[PDB]
């Protein structure tokens, strides 16, 4: 057997099962299951598919605007498939990355399983339900989203990938590989012992003789070991065993967040039955170590870092709940451009895409199992299943759904270098230190530790922000490895004095609210300002925050000033559908999406993105300067809110540079210098006129034209510019390509921005013009967005098949997915009385 053949076997082991499904909302259960159903009345599609995202907004929706005002319901999905002749005796497993929710899977008329969880991955061995002789089988999936189930937009149905594993009767079982590097800090400059465990099952009714062979390789690289073999032993029929080996890898490269292409490795497993290669598998992993102390916080590979982190919902804007590798890559790559090193998957398990991209980009991950325990937060959420018996075929005796779901998530991610924290709850009210909650936290911690001891078990708790933060809930925190504070910076000092051994971080911070390109009262701090005068908008100066919240500056400066507060996960990294605080559940208002994000649903940064970048990215890696606001102040209503007593517009610069000099129409308004300072522990930092300003400010009398900012190093040498220009009346639509080409695989996509521009090419920053889109060629329009919270516009096509969307504050995005045919597609944009534009994107070979 050649290495070529082994790799093919690995590749053939797992396939994409997303293709050729039929969908019908409210379909008849008996017809969906039955062998030769009439599917003329069904919709033929490829997964993932979120059915909720094609709905219109409904002011009367049971989801309410916390759930995006997009309705759920019930639906069936249907696939028919035949095993190849070679595969007839093989074991067949079906994996669903996420189905929301309350699902039932039927194979040839029989119920394989019921699975409540809407975010956790699950698989079924469906071998026994398959027809003999290679006759076609029918798989039918029932998904139910009965509202309200969610405190944010969930979507409905099969929003994540479905995959099929076809294997020998003797095979490495699902989630069966464990890779550990116990002595890595010690052995790192020499040979590092890599302990691998394999969990092999014999589904045959004959006994077979078993050997495992292991090799490690650099991902997209060379081998770093030879073949290492376990001793031959008998595996009895219908039994499973665990195999072990140690492999030595010399001076491996350590996975870190300190570069954007961190080192990854792959374990190759070969399984022999009676001396014949019958199974082959690869498992992604990395070499990293970390430590965390109460007063010094966190270090990765001996380097002290803070969690510069974001909370993220799953949700892709116009894509709705449909997960996509390219969409998630763009979101995460962009987070990383800001200086983010850490994401929290709030509040639910992550997709395979998110976990993989995080390993690929160098982002530390906290994956969260639960938004509630046994109490519940919404009637149709998970709370009702939490203590009920798992009915999964492969559930262990006495396992509750919470037990089974937590276990399986940890087994799925135990080898992923990115994950360093497992969260067993967010804002669990019932976790107050009573006997029941105390029992429950211990049970849950123990589930994890029976699988994985290497990662921090944690929770995100807002109980610490009430009063002095102390209470029976402190007893629950005692059971955790690390204790997450939600919005509790005010009680940290006291809580820290009380619990000197606690490892503390901000599990949820800020909740500042902003609308891109919208400005209000920069001079004030606005607390939960949801009045009619706000016009359903919040300020991009970043001076709006909810009642329990903090601004970016307040929340970041605190984190920065305290070593024992290890970092934070800001709410939120990007906008999501739903939860439109400060207009939460005011359902007759137009708001349907969040204000919390640093970036809007359209992927377009708000100004605070640049504030964070100035703080988190070194001037060596990326010198920058960013100006706000815009320079169009002709409109008196707009200006009356921004301009001060003398009618000057406060202009502000974010920079990681030493100084910024602002020019109006070529004339200097003065050079200003950041004040340099040190943390009590000697970390160096920069700030402005005072401790509450991380920016430089100029009060500028409004003269139309150009503002330009020159950023300089200490030598007085220019390292960065930014520039803002007054726009004229809209003259045209401009389309901006992110990608010159994408892959022709039917999965890759591109984001093209549309701007409303004047005759000189300046973006009109106030423009809300409606744009109509045409697509020709080898592509599929799959979304449109402008990020605006108060918009009730379709994200998808209109009822007549049209694609339209307004600009909001000059900008928006359109999303095009590739087909499986190489060639090109062209996007033309039109707006009324404006010039049109087109860009062409090529589709073809990959990478």
mmCIF file of C-alpha atoms in Angstrom, residues 93 114-117 120-124 370 382 386 388-411 443-444 447:
data_model
loop_
_atom_site.group_PDB
_atom_site.id
_atom_site.type_symbol
_atom_site.label_atom_id
_atom_site.label_comp_id
_atom_site.label_asym_id
_atom_site.label_seq_id
_atom_site.Cartn_x
_atom_site.Cartn_y
_atom_site.Cartn_z
ATOM 1 C CA UNK A 93 -22.556 7.424 9.682
ATOM 2 C CA UNK A 114 -34.575 12.694 18.314
ATOM 3 C CA UNK A 115 -32.125 15.483 19.034
ATOM 4 C CA UNK A 116 -33.211 18.589 20.942
ATOM 5 C CA UNK A 117 -30.036 20.658 20.750
ATOM 6 C CA UNK A 120 -24.469 20.916 19.031
ATOM 7 C CA UNK A 121 -23.149 18.523 16.432
ATOM 8 C CA UNK A 122 -24.645 15.030 16.264
ATOM 9 C CA UNK A 123 -24.257 11.903 14.196
ATOM 10 C CA UNK A 124 -26.077 8.642 13.802
ATOM 11 C CA UNK A 370 -25.408 26.410 27.315
ATOM 12 C CA UNK A 382 -33.061 24.202 25.717
ATOM 13 C CA UNK A 386 -31.594 19.944 30.077
ATOM 14 C CA UNK A 388 -34.257 14.829 30.543
ATOM 15 C CA UNK A 389 -32.723 11.542 29.489
ATOM 16 C CA UNK A 390 -30.661 11.548 26.385
ATOM 17 C CA UNK A 391 -32.375 9.276 23.894
ATOM 18 C CA UNK A 392 -29.507 9.243 21.404
ATOM 19 C CA UNK A 393 -28.663 5.691 20.390
ATOM 20 C CA UNK A 394 -25.106 6.169 21.607
ATOM 21 C CA UNK A 395 -25.961 7.965 24.850
ATOM 22 C CA UNK A 396 -24.521 6.362 27.941
ATOM 23 C CA UNK A 397 -26.685 4.996 30.707
ATOM 24 C CA UNK A 398 -28.061 7.708 32.995
ATOM 25 C CA UNK A 399 -26.930 10.581 30.788
ATOM 26 C CA UNK A 400 -29.128 13.632 30.596
ATOM 27 C CA UNK A 401 -29.219 15.706 27.461
ATOM 28 C CA UNK A 402 -26.941 18.220 29.163
ATOM 29 C CA UNK A 403 -24.520 15.431 30.003
ATOM 30 C CA UNK A 404 -24.547 13.957 26.502
ATOM 31 C CA UNK A 405 -24.366 17.302 24.671
ATOM 32 C CA UNK A 406 -21.512 18.638 26.802
ATOM 33 C CA UNK A 407 -19.619 15.392 26.531
ATOM 34 C CA UNK A 408 -19.936 15.204 22.750
ATOM 35 C CA UNK A 409 -18.913 18.809 22.164
ATOM 36 C CA UNK A 410 -15.753 18.332 24.227
ATOM 37 C CA UNK A 411 -14.910 15.067 22.428
ATOM 38 C CA UNK A 443 -21.666 17.175 37.478
ATOM 39 C CA UNK A 444 -20.935 19.310 34.406
ATOM 40 C CA UNK A 447 -18.208 15.500 32.350
#
